[PDB]
């Protein structure tokens, strides 16, 4: 599994409230989280398919 799949979810730093998807490596599921617009890390997908295809 790619190392980004174990990066913790990170809302970043902006002022937005975007709905994003991250891979929860403890649960082995792609779940919703809130992203603020800027920053964060690579465990941050626009769609669920992107997440499931990368980390499952």
**Domain locations in the chain as residue ranges:** 1-56
Contacts of 5 (CB under 8 A, 6+ apart): 23, 25, 43, 54, 55
Going from the C-alpha of 48 to that of each of 13, 41, 44, 53, the distances in angstroms are 22, 17, 10, 8
Q: Categorise residue 37: left if φ over 0, alpha if ψ from -120 to 50, beta otherwise.
A: left
- Residue 22 in 3-state DSSP? strand
Residue with tokens 């920053």: 39
Q: Where are the beta strands (DSSP E) in 1-56?
A: 18-24, 29-35
CA pair distance 14, 2, nearest whole angstrom: 26
Taking residue 28's Cβ as centre, other Cβ atoms within 10 Å add up to 10
Q: How was this structure determined?
A: X-ray
Residue at token pair 């992203």: 35
Is residue 1 classed as helix, strand or coil in its secondary structure? coil
Alpha-carbon span 33 to 1, nearest angstrom: 21
């Amino acid at each position: 599994l790619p190392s980004l799949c174990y990066e913790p979810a990170d809302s970043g730093s902006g002022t937005k409230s975007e709905k994003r998807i991250y891979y929860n490596s403890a649960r082995k599921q792609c779940l919703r989280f809130t992203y603020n617009g800027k920053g964060g890390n690579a465990n941050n997908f626009i769609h669920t398919f992107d997440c499931q295809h990368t980390c499952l």
